[PDB]
Amino acid sequence: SLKFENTGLENQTVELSRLDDIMERLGFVRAAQWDYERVTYDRKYVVKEGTYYLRVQGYAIEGNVDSRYALIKLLTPIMGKHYYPHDEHFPSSLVSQCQNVLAQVKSELEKIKEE
């Protein structure tokens, strides 16, 4: 339920193949692949209490999810939390790390924006 506002990600669109390359490079794997409207990427931070995951998601505004060419509009990134083995408190260090990763997501998208 933690969100990251003001990353700039929601303000520009990107081709899916170009998004995919960027995400894999930055440690994300595809997630929630049952959804045909949205593409989802998770970067996992496993800890003693379980798994935190930085989730970046976008919808196909043009084309579709199963196509090489699809135009993706990104939504507000979130950090999810899963407890294993069994009001959420989010660790400030992990918040800072996720902020850093999102900054490089944004920087990589800015580098190809005009092409």
Side-chain angles (χ1 to χ4, degrees), residues 41-68:
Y41 307 88
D42 281 356
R43 186 180 165 154
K44 293 162 171 62
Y45 293 85
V46 301
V47 287
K48 137 141 199 141
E49 37 273 298
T51 298
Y52 291 93
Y53 54 94
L54 177 55
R55 175 158 290 195
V56 176
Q57 206 170 47
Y59 58 82
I61 198 163
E62 248 142 82
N64 80 301
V65 160
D66 297 312
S67 180
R68 188 205 175 273

Side-chain angles (χ1 to χ4, degrees), residues 1-17:
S1 242
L2 190 67
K3 300 198 93 169
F4 302 90
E5 305 290 337
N6 311 299
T7 63
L9 293 182
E10 312 96 319
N11 299 325
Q12 91 292 294
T13 58
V14 60
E15 192 172 330
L16 178 57
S17 58

Side-chain angles (χ1 to χ4, degrees), residues 15-34:
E15 192 172 330
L16 178 57
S17 58
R18 305 195 182 191
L19 182 60
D20 271 326
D21 281 319
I22 287 165
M23 294 290 108
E24 198 224 312
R25 231 152 72 210
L26 303 177
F28 290 81
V29 300
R30 273 287 193 109
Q33 292 179 96
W34 51 85

